[PDB]
Point group: C4
């Protein structure tokens, strides 16, 4: 079944576990059903035994007896190299739970057949054993919520938290049932049940009442346990509600804290108002108000996943310029995997003429204008690259580039560019032809690039150069 | 309109979205107005229907009917490739909201025209549909608060949090309105309204009262919902107030925690009291009691922003000594971008004669005294550099330097200095001339530097050397 | 004794401390016993003095007098280079504590022997001095909990937290004792004690009561201190309960926050549903829902511990293929220490033919299929390595590798592989022989590897190659 | 005065600020005194105006009038390039505060000289202006607590937090004063004041009372503000108390969380019980249960501070073996600065014979035994180094070393050792002589080291070698 694969985590380990079991599950599902039944019975017991004057061989009493027998069978199954482990498990918790899971109803029936009634019904408080089984069961459903990782959809945050607070409300209803039982031991059924539920809600809300003077010491202790259990109800409710609220607020509070650290730095260095506003604008236009570590996220993923994420992010980039389209997938995906993300505001000079360059930019969003002396301006739209001339020649920049609209680029470092272009020689001549044509259009001269640039591959490179020149001619 | 640019985040994407829409906003503003009106109506409904005995065709009843018609029109617009999406949206939430947004007032009027009054007015509880629309609306105003990034000014922390706690107070007033309606269903207008508001405030404050014995099961349930909604009011109020308080608390608590980690380290290594106080003094004199990661902050900004921040920080540095003023902007901005920040206390020996040097220091605040044998002392004030002789010669230091006042310097590493000076050869001879003059003033020997240092550029270098010697002569 | 070793942290420092003491513990155990006795006496004093009308030379009064004498002896011992330190300690806290630890019972007995009774018994409020000693004692048991690092077993989280909340309950019982004493000063023993305990529990639970009008100013102040001490009881209880709850909550909340950051990244880049599901599947199949930093954890451990952890993790890996079994332990443990962990889903192509490789993989879980042209498919099961051909030849990959089941691999980088193989030359010939046989089986040609690969060691290498070919023949 | 240095942060900036002021403090101290007086007056006003039937030209009324005049003078001083700034400051907050700081007592006296009494005394509610000045003052004392950085001693955590909670208690007393004033407007002095304080405390602890039916709308609003201000008192008290508690809790919770992450890793890899216990023992013996990042802490300190910290940590190390004592301070401090800290349990093999070594160990705590074939064992105590032979010869290790007691070592990497020993050639021959003598004692061959090792400096090296051999012989 799927239980073996879920427990092992993979088919290969599940097959080995099955083979080992055969050489030497459904029981888990039966245990889950028994745990649900035991939780229901443990909820009903304070509301059933206290409310009912006597069992009177009721059909619900028969159902409770059947549930107790099922719990005893579950304990026996849990009790069952193997002998020593079974003995240790029995001596650890199983013996105590089995003794505390004695058939109190059957014992009372036998005693009656063979004040005293209240003492006998006090043995029905052995539902605390079912509550201990329910603590094992909440551990189990924690394991199951691990199995249902996030129910495969965290559409509205923790939805299992709704079940947790529902269980807390059920425990608080148990507290109210005990509070109702206290005067029952001290001294219309639907109306009484609703009144008890309302009293439980009021106690959880600490509305206030004039009840006091328990007189009986046992009654005083009963009110003491009622008060402390109501306190635990309040504490659990407030803790879970505050946890949810703090998670919902933290969703933005993480970014708010990071930007508050940024603001602290800006206030230390005392930047002018305009510079502060520009930094704020860049932060909002880059992170969009979200929190992540792109380097860390892509580092902690394996190679194929990072490869496919990067190939998806720049799909329009690889589709737009023909140089990537004609190229083989290996080089394309390597060059993609070595790209980094940057965003430039209008007016920022990405590359200044006469500077020493260290990276190449691919435009994915926006348009950037190349300007230089005596050659007028010309703009590079989406899906085009600039900075190849300095990278190939290893010299000073020839023309300046300026962002005139909010633009999103990917930058390729000099080391990564040289490494990739060395492990794929053909794209070196491709970029050389493109850069020679581009620089001839610009009007400058480049002897080293022409010397370096000096068949079907040649025709493909010429076509790519023509297409790139036509696209950049805008 | 500006809505397209705000949604797309840039003009380039906004234009593409507009072109796509034309090939195939104001509605957003109308939806915002309708959401505000619906929030007002949902606030008024518990206070209006419960308080008023009957609608009686009042002008406010006409306004409520108009608001219901507007909500129905909004639902119809939300309902309206496109057919399948519209059908899915209708089957998901739109159909249920539209059914729950039925004209209860019109239906009641038709029934009256064609105990029963209370049952008919119970259909006005369909304002829960308007409350669901208001949940969509708080999601929308979360989106809008993202649009108004931080209202462009976080002068007094989260100011939107004030609106959030005001909305929480409005919800708690809704709870009080329900609490007032409970005895109205069970069994001077301004005075009654104020009394109800005071009762709501008291319930939120859990002052306490003798109210009990709802008798009616519906009345008991009404008090139950009143209690739980008051509990949610309390939880939301305490959560938001605590978050607000802890923001300001954490503003200083982050630095306190970092320094407590420092103190834990300092206690682990068991440093003396004087060294403990010296470390504390350095921490207070460097970080000024603020938390940031200068390396991380400057790393996560793009190149022009980091360039302008660094060029602003060292403005007095670049302006003060003529070597930077005469130089071209590219070299100046690069070498500034490679500087690091270090603060030295008085008495600390920055550079000891005979040691092997690895960095060069530019003084931005304070004065440091150069001392060595037989040449007396001489002091370097703001805007001057020391450490060039070792960097150029690649040998041992020639004179010792000692901070005599709390000083703030920027240090340039050996690798960065060699890289920058290699990509800009002219400043190599500039620093060589300056260092040769300085060492001739000191009286040591720099034969390697003299050999390395051995037109208009020469005259400019000589003038820079003379100015640097005159400034350092103090 | 073990106290010296526990305080010093090692036997070497303990011996030096013992030698220094001899040249110039059990007292710690006696101080612990005295602190326990003082805590018991400080708990009993509000419940004993207030409840009892007079001491009447009771046996418990004799026990209290003996405890006071023991406390005085402890103070004297604490009072006792050494003279100056003792004087400073006496002038700091010891003198005040000793004065406040005066024998109030003996003084009262002497005064009686030589309204006034209440004034004399007010001197018994000097149990606040024992409470100050108990504050020193809670500091001491914090030190002891550091000595019992985590009791050597954190089986059920902080178990010392149970003792802390028990002490908080004891303090709240002290508050209730003061609340009982308030009307005793203003104006069946077991029943009264239980009633007082119930009143204390109710005050901690803020149930509410009609008690008011203290009339006496001292009575009003007594109720004021009772209220504020109940406030501290409530605050401490809620704080410790919330910390306990949030520990277990954070155990899963840390992973949930990391995956929420991943989800924010995924929502920013707008990946399709299938890609989001694949990323979620990889995250759940790699981290298993746990939080750690394998690099950080293995970095902050010393070399032998990391060595043994890594040697344990790959025990089946080293045992399975004979190449590691025949090898000397040094090379095996080094190459294991340089392995990294990766996990590949089915369908993912680990190595594509024609790509440039930078790492080679060892399979520890799952099976991966080698496929290439004209040679059909063949599957590599657990305990086998692929990718050595590219590493040795320093060329393009020869065959493609595809994961067909969820597989867990360790990868060895190119730099680490070359460094290890250079510091151990024999395994280079071993891998060369194995890879030459493997590539001959594949059907391609490798001249460089054959030239590089061109005694008992040779026979062992041939046997290892035959075994590896037989294992990979599946 | 010291105010200029405190504000500027250094003497150099303070002198420049003083020169600029002279070209164009005590006022700060006067403002502090005025703020303290205004806080006292704002505390007294709810307790003075409400309690007193009329001013009656009392001496305390004269004092209040003087305080109001002082506040007016402070506002005038705050009001006083400079004209525009003063006008902007006046139009921002100063005008409103000055108008609200009108002499209400003088105005009432003039009106009386020239029901109505209550209306006139309602103008004394202008103490809200003093409360706004007190908010400016709490901002100011936040600045002052930044000036008193941690009061120069965080002996018992945040002691300023005690003042903060005292101010919160004062605000809650203000709330109680308003609560007392509410029935005073609706309808033995020490007894009444104590009763009001007790009522304020009871409201703070929400004990509960039968007060209700305000009748008057103004009375109902008064109880409403009283309730909300009491709620703010409760929220501030619980927030500050929880922050205080969680500081001490987090002091150990941070280490507990790090070790819980370690335990999660250990459970993920499923290490045996003995290995888990060994890892726990190493963690407790290395970190001693403390949280820090030695690399980060030493990285964020400047060079002289790190130099002195490291020179202090290894004081016994540098003093013990004579090689460091004879050496010049520069080399000693550099090689100390490049040391790292490690700790080895007994039984761990630090260096195994036949392995390739990459670091050298200096013993600072404990003893490690060198063992090898045919040469028996011999032990290296505190203050001695091993690993020099492999570092100098760049070959395999010659003998194995084993920790037999919990030992603390400093390790010096191969790159750092080669760098330091290259920049200081003399210690190369020193270590060569020592290692040659040591290996001759061992009985192996070091022909390369002997060739490499082949005046006063020679005599010093020989003496150092003899002393090192004598120390190692033990
Ligand atoms: N005339 C042109 N046509 C197309 N691209 C150009 C032209 N002139 C300059 N560029 C690009 O602009 C870049 C600016 O920096 P580089 O000189 O490194 O490389 C340059 C080319 O990539
Ligand atoms: N006579 C001098 N005039 C100016 N600067 C000096 C003089 N002597 C030394 N210095 C500076 O002090 C520095 C000390 O270290 P360096 O030798 O690396 O480089 C030295 C110069 O920068
Ligand atoms: N016939 C074969 N038998 C065993 N292993 C192979 C065979 N063909 C390819 N491989 C392995 O598959 C790997 C794929 O990448 P490499 O060429 O780097 O190295 C290859 C070998 O490790
Ligand atoms: N006879 C000896 N006397 C002192 N030290 C030794 C002796 N033999 C080995 N050692 C030390 O033990 C170290 C073990 O590793 P290395 O060979 O790198 O360097 C060795 C020396 O530092």
């Amino acid at each position: 079944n799927k239980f073996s694969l879920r427990m092992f985590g993979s088919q290969k380990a599940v097959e080995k576990e099955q083979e080992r079991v055969k050489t030497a599950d459904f029981r888990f599902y039966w245990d889950l059903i028994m745990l649900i039944m035991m939780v229901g019975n443990l909820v009903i017991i304070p509301v059933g035994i206290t409310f009912f004057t006597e069992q009177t061989t009721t059909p619900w009493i028969i159902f409770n007896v059947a549930s107790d027998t099922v719990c005893l069978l579950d304990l026996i199954m849990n009790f069952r190299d193997p002998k020593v482990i079974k003995m240790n498990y029995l001596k650890s918790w199983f013996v105590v739970d089995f003794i505390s899971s004695i058939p109190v109803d059957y014992i009372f029936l036998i005693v009656e057949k063979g004040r005293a009634l209240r003492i006998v019904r006090f043995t029905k408080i052995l539902c605390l054993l079912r509550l201990l089984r329910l603590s094992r069961l909440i551990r189990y459903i924690h394991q199951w919520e691990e199995i249902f990782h996030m129910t495969y959809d965290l559409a509205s945050a923790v939805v299992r938290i709704f079940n947790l607070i529902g269980m807390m409300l059920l425990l608080c209803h148990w507290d109210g049932c005990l509070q109702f039982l206290v005067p029952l031991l001290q001294d219309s059924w639907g109306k009484q049940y609703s009144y008890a539920l309302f009293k439980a809600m009021s106690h959880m809300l600490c509305i206030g009442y004039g009840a006091q003077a328990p007189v009986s010491m046992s009654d005083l202790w009963i009110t003491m346990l009622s008060m402390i259990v109501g306190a635990t109800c309040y504490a659990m409710f407030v803790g879970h509600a505050t946890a949810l609220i703090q998670s919902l607020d933290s969703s933005r509070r993480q970014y708010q804290e990071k930007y508050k650290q940024v603001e602290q730095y800006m206030s230390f260095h005392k930047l002018p108002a305009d510079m502060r506003q520009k930094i704020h604008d860049y932060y909002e236009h880059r992170y969009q108000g979200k929190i992540f570590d792109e380097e860390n996220i892509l580092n902690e993923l394996n190679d194929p996943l990072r490869e496919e994420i990067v190939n998806f992010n720049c799909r329009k980039l690889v589709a737009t310029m023909p140089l990537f389209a004609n190229a083989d997938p290996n080089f394309v995906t390597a060059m993609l995997s070595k790209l980094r993300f940057e965003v430039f505001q209008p007016g920022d000079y990405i590359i200044r003429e006469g500077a020493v360059g260290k990276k190449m930019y691919f435009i994915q969003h926006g348009v950037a204008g190349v300007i230089t002396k005596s050659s007028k301006e010309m703009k590079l739209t989406d899906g085009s690259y600039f900075g190849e001339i300095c990278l190939l020649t290893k010299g000073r920049r020839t023309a300046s580039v300026r962002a005139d609209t909010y633009c999103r680029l990917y930058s390729l470092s000099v080391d990564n560019f040289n490494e990739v272009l060395e492990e794929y020689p053909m794209m070196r001549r491709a970029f050389e032809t493109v850069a020679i044509d581009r620089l001839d259009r610009i009007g400058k001269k480049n002897s080293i690039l022409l010397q370096k640039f000096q068949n079907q591959e040649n025709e493909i490179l010429k076509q790519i150069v023509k297409h790139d020149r036509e696209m950049v001619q805008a």
